[PDB]
Amino acid sequence: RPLIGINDGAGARIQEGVVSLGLYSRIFHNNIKASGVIPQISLIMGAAAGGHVYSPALTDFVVMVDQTSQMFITGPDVIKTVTGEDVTMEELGGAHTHMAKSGTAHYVASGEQDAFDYVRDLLSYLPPNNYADPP
Amino acid sequence: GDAVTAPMQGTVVKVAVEEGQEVSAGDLVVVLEAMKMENPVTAHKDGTITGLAVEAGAAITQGTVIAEI
């Protein structure tokens, strides 16, 4: 059956140890096993940071919210420290950036209800799995 | 080309060469402290160190020319 992930999180929980990295590895591995088996859709509805970005990247469709949502691996403070570049979190990881430049987003919704309408439209074309007959 | 260039923004903690020194390919030319790594930057070809444009302690920016060779 299709899997919808709604993603909104500051990456690994730093007080928990490497265990967070083990669970991230297992989540990615399951997205890879499911890749080409079931429709995987990722909604991004806040700042997804660090580990939270590769799971959407491995899913089939990524839907973002125009300026409420962001994705980035490395935060602005680290980019400033290493490279000197001042960048806002919106300019670094905004939905417009990932549409127009990175090519990672498939839709930029005007709001959360628009994002849900696009996810329902997407699902309306897809079968539930790679062997069921389509609607 | 005829430029050793800084591969990333970093702080010069060593310059391993003298103006007019002959250097072989793979020779160390500078050390830049960047990303918490004392990165070596090396001569990409046999040549002579000329126009050297670094000194110790300076922060230098990416793409800065370090020496001609």
């Binding site: 059956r1 539930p128 799995n129 069921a132 | -």
Partner: protein, 172 residues
């Protein structure tokens, strides 16, 4: 269970058991191999497996009656469920094996205080729920429509990865 698996009937477990029955006659009767066959059949079956726990689910009873660890798909408990390695009276007797003067006045007091604490804190749904060994604790009236929703989800379940081979051996 093996027959139902062969004819693809989904399996619903309705647990309420203290586990295997103790006794020398049951030991001599083969209870280890028979229980091992029950454990084998539950894991072998590929059909959708859904479990509802009512009241007691102790030890091997919890495990064998379609636990999540033995490949049950969805696990629900009524709020009366009691999931533990052993029931309160058995844990109390296992403690009273130490300083074992059961004629004493106070031991029969601390027994009941221990059983009260154990039935409040240990033999409950809540540790299994907070650890995720069971997927929901439900109001009892929800059960019929919950089972419909669950088995409709599981209608197409494919079990795997499994290595195809002549057969799986079982305790015999």
């Amino acid at each position: 269970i093996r027959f139902c698996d062969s004819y693809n009937l989904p399996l619903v477990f309705v647990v309420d058991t203290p586990g295997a029955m103790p006794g020398v006659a049951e030991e001599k009767g083969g209870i280890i191999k028979r229980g091992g066959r029950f454990f084998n059949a539950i894991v072998e079956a590929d059909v959708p497996k859904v479990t509802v726990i009512i009241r007691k689910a102790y030890g091997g009873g919890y495990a064998v009656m379609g636990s999540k660890q033995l490949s049950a798909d969805l696990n629900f408990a009524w709020p009366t469920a009691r999931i533990a390695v052993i029931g309160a009276e058995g844990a109390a007797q296992l403690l009273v094996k130490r300083f074992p003067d059961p004629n004493a006045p106070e031991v029969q007091k601390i027994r009941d205080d221990f059983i009260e604490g154990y039935n409040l804190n240990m033999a409950t749904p809540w540790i299994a729920a907070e650890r995720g060994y069971i997927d929901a604790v439900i109001q009892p009236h929800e059960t019929r429509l919950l089972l419909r929703k669950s088995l409709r989800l599981l209608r197409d379940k494919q079990n795997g990865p499994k290595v195809q081979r002549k057969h799986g051996l079982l305790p015999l």
